[PDB]
Design a protein around this nucleic acid. Structure first.
Ligand SMILES: [Mg+2]
Ligand SMILES: [Mg+2]
Ligand SMILES: [Mg+2]
Ligand SMILES: [Mg+2]
Ligand SMILES: [Mg+2]
Ligand SMILES: [Mg+2]
Ligand SMILES: [Mg+2]
Ligand SMILES: [Mg+2]
Ligand SMILES: [Mg+2]
Ligand SMILES: [Mg+2]
Ligand SMILES: [Mg+2]
Lengths: 116, 104, 155, 203, 119, 50
RNA sequence: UCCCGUGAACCAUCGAGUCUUUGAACGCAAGUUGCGCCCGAGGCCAUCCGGCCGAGGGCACGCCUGCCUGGGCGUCACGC
RNA sequence: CGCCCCACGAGGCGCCGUCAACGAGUCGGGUUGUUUGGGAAUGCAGCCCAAAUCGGGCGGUAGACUCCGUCCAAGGCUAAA
RNA sequence: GCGCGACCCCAGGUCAGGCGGGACUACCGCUGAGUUUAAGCAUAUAAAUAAGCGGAGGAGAAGAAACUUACAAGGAUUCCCCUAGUAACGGCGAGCGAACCGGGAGCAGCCCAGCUUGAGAAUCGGGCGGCUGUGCCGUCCGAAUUGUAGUCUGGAGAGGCG
């Protein structure tokens, strides 16, 4: 030896090789697009937002985040979001403001879903 | 199972006979019934008692002989009747005696 | 773990070992031990793979011949209880004691028993090396009770 | 048969050979943790006679306990009460150290069940016991009829509940006649029985 | 749609019907906030139909996987039998019937013979 | 506080909903005993204690 | 169409399923939806046949049996 | 009720006289503490001393001798009331 | 310049697995008071209780004499009646207080360790494979000779003859 301190030698370990999976079923995606966009909020405030800012205002799942919100607004509606803002309403539900790229028109999307 | 006539302890009750716990090894041997077989056929065995009197031994030996006299034993199987069994013709009237079948 | 096991031999050196335990560390010589182990290697027990065949090939003798033609094999005996029974019944011709048995009380009493039942005994070095003779991890005692007629002089 | 030899050699505990080997084992023990797994019994005969077997699932664990009595844990030796409960320093614990060691090993070793425990070595401050533990989820114990009785659920924490050899010793169950008639089924059971006011229906 | 006919479908068709039902649920929550009157009850039916079709998905899937692992291989924890923890930690009847050799002899010999008296 | 933790925000959300008059159609419902919401809470009188 | 039936029901009952965040609570903590690490169905382009986004799922503590990689002249036999 | 027929193994019974193996810091003793109805000490516990194999524990007054009655601890399982 | 074997101990998100917490009626172990009574109070009493700390089950605990008795003796455990408010214990004050015998309820006794296959670990676990699937069987590893299985448990037993 050279150093007067003894250290635990580098052993070799194996990664897990289970003989039977502790979970058989594949976990279903419970935050699918339909749980993650419950419904577009249609109060007069969001109504004015539709034309003045080209944004759709949704009530979204409380466990959703901006990444999943954009990914979901892309799969539904065949659109994409330039930006998304989220707040949690006092009533408990999360409300999301989805601002569209200017290629897409919020009035056309909101008429193809039916809000106005 | 069968129980022996024994004396009580204790000057107050020394003369008053009562049912004990089991026949001693001496008693089983002299009545011709093996140790391990006696509890099988309804005869208690008390390896802890001691026989200190012929008066006690023959008193219980008469009980062993009486029990073997009026004992019936079904065969372990249906047709095979081995030694120590009993004949079907008198097996067919067998009943369940109720109460004390040998009073003391 | 290393520290206590080194201090173990240090403390066993410092303290005054009593005669009963000091009879150990006085082992059979190197040449004599190797020469004896040559013979102990000659008289090894039966392996497991070598024990399957002895029972598998008597099949023809048991199913068809209805005869037992086998003879007595000569092997070294082992196990503390079996060897102590043999030594007390005087069917032991030689006893081999491992010097390094832990706990030592398993073999402390052997030398007096051997000596006063008048049995040749040696304390060789290495219970693992004894265990190899019989294919177990530790053996702690061996004994020869009989040798083939072609090796009596050299025994 | 060697176990008679080794048992008698452990009977002679003040001989020179045992003094030597027991002092050196005491030092080795004092240099290790309190609870340590050990591969094999140091007292094969004593372990066997208590139900140890060279079989998988029977483990041996060496337990250390301090000696001396139980000195009352009160904040400054102040015991608020009448003078007859006011002592501190000469009180004795009503469980023997063998039981204390079993009840240490039982708590630290949850998945195993305490079978027995036996003295191995002793000094001025610590007693060393070897506790035999049994792994009752292990098939080689499930398939041994002499030890299945320990796999039934009613034998959980025998050590913590007073059911082992030390348990019965300190419960005073070693005896049957007078001098031991109050301790059946237990001292508390007999106290309850003797205190129950039997008010018969037609009293 | 009914379950008697809903088990009797293929996996792809059953998930495709799941997807269509979920889109319908989306549009009914759409019209919940704006309109009312007559379509507001179909949401109950669509929700229960989601429940039916997912129950069929899961029941059929777990039945198939019970078949697959029920070659008496190692069975997974979500498939092993949960009864109670005591039940899982009891001994099997063979384990309980373990009795020693001397007792096996004492029951081959010296059984409990069957007797009466007054013979 | 304007800086409230999410736990407190989530648990003040519920005590919002917990404070509403009973639906009118509860009163006409058969074999009913509900006369009003006997668990209303006012912000100046009963502090939520958290 | 739920009505001489694959069948209503705030019905009964129970075997097939779901069972959010927690809590013995178990990745680390917690007036924090805080901070990590690993596997990975699936897709992208190819800075290679690699990398990026992942659906999900692991990662606690002591313990037993076994297996793997190891440490110490603790006991050695054999060797340079 | 039916087919399967029970041994050279084990058991029981009778005799013999040869062996006859039985649990250790455990019992047991002193002192302390607690507890008990247990009183020259009922159990338990700490510390010290510490065994026995023609022996050991009991026989409710400590003590030694003689005899007698009795049981075999320091490992384990066990419904029923 | 090493390859070996054993011991003892490491680290493994290794394979397979058991632990922890909850309920309080009843049950087991430890710990453990005082208000009160004694017309005060300090031993005693309250009480070997309440509180504290743990552990299980459908019951728990005990249980097959190192027993009681002094008899013509009986005979595991548990519970009820009687023993008995008795013997005893107690500033012999307040008070406290069992057991044997007997009658009933129910009754079942068992298995280990040690001397004992030594022509020969006859034993057990695990991986894999099969089938008839709470197990059985084959193969390969491991445990184990510091002793697994079998025989034995004092009432015996081991041997030998029938
Ligand atoms: Mg924000
Ligand atoms: Mg106390
Ligand atoms: Mg005392
Ligand atoms: Mg018990
Ligand atoms: Mg007063
Ligand atoms: Mg007063
Ligand atoms: Mg006063
Ligand atoms: Mg309490
Ligand atoms: Mg029980
Ligand atoms: Mg009276
Ligand atoms: Mg009292």
């Amino acid at each position: 030896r050279t150093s007067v301190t003894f250290h635990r030698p580098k052993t070799l370990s194996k990664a897990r090789d289970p003989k039977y999976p502790r979970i058989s079923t594949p976990g279903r995606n419970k935050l699918d697009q339909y749980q993650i966009l419950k419904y577009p909020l249609t109060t007069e405030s969001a109504m004015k937002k539709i034309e003045d800012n080209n944004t759709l205002v949704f009530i979204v799942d409380l466990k959703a985040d901006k990444k999943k919100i954009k990914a979901a607004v892309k799969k539904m509606y065949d659109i994409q979001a330039k930006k998304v803002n989220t707040l949690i309403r006092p009533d408990g539900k999360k409300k999301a403001y989805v601002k569209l790229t200017p290629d897409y028109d919020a009035l056309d999307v909101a008429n193809k879903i039916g809000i106005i | 199972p069968l129980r022996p006539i024994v004396q009580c302890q204790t000057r107050k009750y020394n003369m008053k006979a009562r049912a004990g716990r089991g026949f001693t090894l001496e008693e089983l041997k002299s009545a011709g019934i093996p140790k391990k077989l006696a509890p099988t056929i309804g005869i208690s065995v008390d390896h802890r008692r001691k026989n200190r009197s012929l008066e006690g031994m023959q008193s219980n030996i008469q009980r062993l002989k009486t029990y073997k006299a009026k004992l019936v034993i079904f065969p372990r199987r249906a047709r095979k009747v081995k030694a120590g069994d009993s004949t079907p013709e008198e097996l067919a009237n067998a009943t369940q005696v109720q109460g004390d079948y040998m009073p003391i | 773990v290393v520290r206590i096991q080194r201090q173990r031999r240090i403390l066993k050196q410092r303290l005054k070992v009593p005669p009963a335990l000091h009879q150990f560390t006085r082992t059979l010589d190197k040449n004599l031990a190797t020469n004896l182990f040559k013979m102990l290697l000659k008289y090894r027990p039966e392996d497991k793979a070598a024990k399957k065949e002895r029972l598998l090939k008597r099949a023809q003798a048991e199913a068809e011949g209805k005869t037992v033609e086998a003879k007595k094999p000569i092997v070294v005996k082992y196990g503390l209880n079996h060897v102590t029974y043999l030594i007390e019944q005087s069917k032991a011709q030689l006893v081999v004691i491992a010097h390094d048995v832990d706990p030592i009380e398993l073999v402390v009493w052997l030398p007096a028993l051997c000596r006063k039942m008048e049995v040749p005994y040696c304390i060789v070095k290495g219970k693992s090396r004894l265990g190899s003779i019989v294919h177990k991890k530790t053996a702690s005692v061996l004994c020869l009770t009989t040798v083939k007629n072609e090796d009596k002089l050299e025994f | 048969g060697a176990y008679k030899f080794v048992s008698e050699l452990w009977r002679r505990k003040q001989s020179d050979v045992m003094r030597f080997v027991q002092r050196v084992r005491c030092w080795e023990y004092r240099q290790q943790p309190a609870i340590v797994r050990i591969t094999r019994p140091t007292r094969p005969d004593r372990a066997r006679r208590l139900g140890f077997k060279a079989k998988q699932g029977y483990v041996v664990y060496r337990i250390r306990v301090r000696r001396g009595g139980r000195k009352r844990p009160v904040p400054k030796g102040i015991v608020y009460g009448k003078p007859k409960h006011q002592g501190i320093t000469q009180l004795k614990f009503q469980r023997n150290k063998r039981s204390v060691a079993e009840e240490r090993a039982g708590r630290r070793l949850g998945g195993l069940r305490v079978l027995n425990s036996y003295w191995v070595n002793e000094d001025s401050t610590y007693k060393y016991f070897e506790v035999i533990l049994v792994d009752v989820a292990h098939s080689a114990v499930r398939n041994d009829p002499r030890i299945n009785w320990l796999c039934k659920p009613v034998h959980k924490h025998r050590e913590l509940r007073g059911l082992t050899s030390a348990g019965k010793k300190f419960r005073g169950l070693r005896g049957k006649g007078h001098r031991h008639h109050k301790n059946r089924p237990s001292r508390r059971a007999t106290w309850k029985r003797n205190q129950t006011v039997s008010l018969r229906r037609y009293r | 749609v009914k379950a008697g006919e809903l088990w009797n479908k293929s996996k792809d068709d059953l998930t495709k019907q799941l997807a269509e039902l979920k889109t319908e649920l989306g549009q009914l929550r759409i019209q919940k906030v704006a309109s009312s009157g007559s379509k507001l009850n179909r949401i109950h039916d669509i929700r229960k139909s989601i429940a039916r079709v997912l129950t069929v998905i899961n029941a059929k899937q777990r039945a198939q996987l019970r078949l697959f692992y029920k070659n008496k291989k190692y069975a997974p924890l979500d498939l092993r039998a949960k009864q109670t923890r005591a039940i899982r930690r009891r001994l099997s009847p063979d384990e309980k019937s373990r009795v020693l050799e001397k007792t096996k002899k004492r029951t081959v010999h010296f059984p409990q013979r069957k007797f009466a008296i007054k013979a | 506080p304007s800086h409230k933790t999410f736990r407190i925000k989530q648990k003040l959300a519920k005590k919002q909903r917990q404070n509403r008059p009973i639906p009118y159609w509860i009163r006409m419902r058969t074999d009913n005993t509900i006369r009003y919401n006997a668990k209303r809470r006012h912000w100046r009188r009963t502090k939520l204690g958290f």
